[PDB]
């Protein structure tokens, strides 16, 4: 699984622990060992949500499986919770795009998972 | 709808008002209310297009529906026009990837759009 | 084809000529003309892979066709090799997501392909 957050919250407002917390929580949510999980956080972005520049986040979660209607509803609660608590972003100013990746379309360690 | 522009044009060259203009133009183009439109502009990127470091942009437009052959031609005219007029990027140095998202795969405010 | 690499390696560690090299190698690998290849490299990122902040990369390759089981293995070998030799990123700390784009969903030059 990989989770990317792009946000207009400044770099100094991202707690130093936030990548590790996301890693641990996403491992639990996806059922994957934390060694597999990648996280990327991009602050200081030039962005608007509904025409406003108040704090907001555009995110993505890619996984080989563990994506679907019910699972995605659950992830959105988990991840809105974390962005609200740690980055002080209103949950109605967060979008998360979910991608169920085919193992043939994910490269790692000189080869793909297929 | 979500529109993201990555570009090597410098930050100082992005006009004040660009994100609002994109929000308004996309609301008209997609027919979706401006309150739900997200826009993200990332300048100063290390990029090459055709091996050249002249101004270029790599973009994406995600929407739940309103994506298709004829509609994407129209969006590309619109958005290339804006990037040429506002950021001085030649239309032939712009790619825009279009993504028709399943509502179950777009998280927002503790749930999905499904 | 468009290749994007996000990495926590610092900008000073990206060697001169890296974007040219990627352009040239991806043209060979995909069979597309270099004039149409786009490359984007984003260093200094806040990232973790397996909970470690050691050098790592998250990448994507988008192409209209030329994406599939064998081809993607070949790209991963090529690209992980280049990230290891050029940026000193271990291959087991790289993910590359592959996207086979429909031509109707790629805009360019005031239209689509």
Curated annotation (Swiss-Prot), chain C:
It catalyses: 3-phenylpyruvate = enol-phenylpyruvate; L-dopachrome = 5,6-dihydroxyindole-2-carboxylate. One of its GO terms (molecular function) is dopachrome isomerase activity. It is found in: Secreted; Cytoplasm. Induction: Up-regulated in concanavalin-A-treated lymphocytes. Up-regulated in macrophages upon exposure to M.tuberculosis antigens. The active site is at residue 1. Homotrimer. Interacts with CXCR2 extracellular domain. Interacts with the CD74 extracellular domain, USO1, COPS5 and BNIPL. This is Macrophage migration inhibitory factor.
